Write a protein that binds this ligand. Structure first.
Ligand SMILES: Nc1c2ccccc2[nH+]c2ccccc12
Ligand SMILES: *[C@@H]1O[C@H](CO)[C@@H](O)[C@H](O)[C@H]1NC(C)=O
Lengths: 222, 25, 172, 36, 50, 42
């Protein structure tokens, strides 16, 4: 809140204080040097005849400004890796605690990530698991730092995780925003019907209830 | 607000009653 | 349009943002989508400008007359049993600290009045700042403000694109 | 910040200047009348 | 500011909003809740696709 | 005594000094709590 407007408010306070001390000095007809600053701070602060009226009205303005500042603060107080492009995955040896991640041998994620950064696949080959439940247990017990798998199942587990201690990194940062689809047969005469049925279902909207009563991410905070 | 007016006028009656009491005493 | 140009042989491949639709797929087969993205509502963002002086003026006039009348009447009462009076009143308004029985009750009631008025002013400022004009103008297809086709709020699709098909393919 | 603060700040500054300018001559004339 | 924030953000009485509330979805042992008997609540639960 | 008692409670109004100061701090806390309660109520 005090990034850019702070300089403006500070310079405005400085110039108005200079004007006030100058006019107080000009109001000589106790000591101007030793009372003007004290009165100027006292009127601004909560608990600290030409000059009297202006001092009083400026004190009222300062009270209004303090109230506005408190209201603004009240309104304001209402309210780690970021993808594979971080050096944490590529350079795990630069940190004293070694990085450990889970994968699935003879699966799809490892075969997708072996093409890009083969050293990542070579490092991941040492740390292998055999189920999502093992990854969940390791994360609960702290035996594993992070786990990489399909986005949908990971999001579902994070939503249904006990205590909401397992979360992803933001949203929309999926490296490969692929899908599932339906596995047809080469030359099978179903590409003229299945796609049309899926498009009709999407257009008419018959998936909202399914995604609400089958995904139901519990861990939601605002 | 109408409620604020009533709240601020409630103490006026007490103030004027105290003024009358200290005037008669 | 472009779909008819493609069907007429004037085109062979379309590389452009084209929403996948059942009617389009019934005549032109599509490929795997680049990414998934729906349609939202665009509304111009305005910054409110409303500052508490224009909120009320009658209250200011009432308090301005009340301070003077209570000051003069209490000074008359004290004299019984001006510039100095108004200076003292302004000084007490600035700071309650000063810098027979009537003085005590006067101070108590004036301090209470100052406290209640400043509390009301702060509460009004906070309420009007936290309840200002909100940028929330729509939340989706089920938003009631979108439902009413009132002439005050005019909104429509640009052309006969997939938004038109989605609107036509709704039961209600 | 926005006009909500800048406008009221400018109004307060202008009121301060006008009040000082008026009160200076007012007090001068009052003192001259008192001591003639 | 801390007092105001902790007073306006205290413990809320809102514990559920309906059948679609996520807190109702999870059958966690921490929050135990069930119907009294085999009344129409049981039939409604049995007559749901999900 | 009455003047000091009101001054410590009000915002801008050695055995006795310490208790007066701590009671003034308590009064400030009470005023802050009252303002927060009014803000929550409104
Ligand atoms: N749905 C909401 C509320 C419902 C009842 C009371 C307060 C609320 N505050 C909110 C603040 C931000 C977003 C939604 C909010
Ligand atoms: C691939 O490795 C996994 C280890 O998780 C094992 O369960 C599976 O049987 C293996 N498949 C083959 C074909 O060796």
């Amino acid at each position: 809140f005090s990034a850019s407007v702070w300089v403006m408010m500070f310079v405005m306070l400085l110039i108005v204080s200079a004007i006030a001390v100058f006019v107080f000095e000009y109001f000589s007809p106790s000591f101007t040097i030793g009372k003007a600053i004290w009165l100027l701070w006292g009127l601004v602060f909560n608990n600290s005849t030409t000059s009297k009226i202006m001092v009083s009205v400026w004190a009222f303005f300062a009270v209004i400004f303090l109230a506005s500042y408190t209201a603004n603060l009240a309104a304001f107080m209402i309210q780690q890796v970021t993808g594979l492009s971080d050096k944490k995955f590529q350079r795990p040896h630069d940190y004293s605690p070694p990085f450990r991640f889970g994968t699935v041998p003879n699966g799809s994620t490892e075969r997708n990530i072996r093409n890009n950064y083969p050293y990542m696949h070579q490092y991941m080959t040492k740390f292998n698991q055999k189920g999502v439940e093992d990854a969940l247990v390791s994360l609960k017990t702290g035996k594993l730092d992070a786990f990489i798998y399909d986005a949908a199942v990971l999001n579902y587990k994070a939503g249904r995780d006990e205590g909401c201690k397992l979360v992803t990194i933001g949203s929309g940062y999926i490296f490969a925003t692929t899908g599932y689809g339906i596995a047809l047969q080469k030359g099978s005469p179903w590409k003229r019907q299945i796609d049309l049925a899926l498009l009709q279902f999407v257009g008419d909207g018959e998936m909202e209830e399914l995604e609400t009563c089958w995904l139901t991410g519990i861990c939601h905070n605002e | 607000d109408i409620d604020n007016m009533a709240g601020v006028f409630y103490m006026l009656a007490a103030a004027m009653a105290l003024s009358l009491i200290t005037f008669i005493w | 349009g472009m779909m008819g140009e493609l069907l007429s042989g004037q085109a062979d491949m379309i590389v452009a943002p084209l929403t996948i639709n059942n009617e389009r797929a019934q005549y032109i087969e599509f490929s795997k989508p680049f990414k998934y993205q729906g349609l939202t509502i665009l509304v111009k963002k305005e910054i409110p400008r409303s500052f508490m002086q224009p909120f009320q003026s009658t209250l200011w006039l009432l308090v301005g007359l009340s301070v003077h009348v209570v000051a003069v009447m209490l000074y008359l009462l004290d004299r019984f049993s001006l510039s100095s009076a108004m200076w003292f009143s302004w000084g007490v308004l600035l700071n309650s600290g000063i810098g027979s029985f009537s003085a005590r009750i006067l101070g108590m009631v004036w301090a209470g009045f100052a406290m209640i008025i400043v509390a009301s002013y702060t509460a009004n400022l906070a309420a009007f700042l936290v309840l200002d004009r909100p940028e929330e103008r729509i939340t989706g297809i089920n938003d009631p403000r979108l439902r009413n086709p009132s002439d005050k709020f005019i909104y429509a699709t640009v052309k006969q694109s997939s938004v038109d098909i989605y609107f036509r393919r709704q039961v209600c | 910040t926005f006009e909500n603060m800048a406008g009221v700040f400018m109004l307060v500054a202008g009121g301060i200047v006008a009040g000082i300018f008026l009160i200076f001559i007012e007090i001068a004339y009052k003192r001259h009348k008192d001591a003639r």
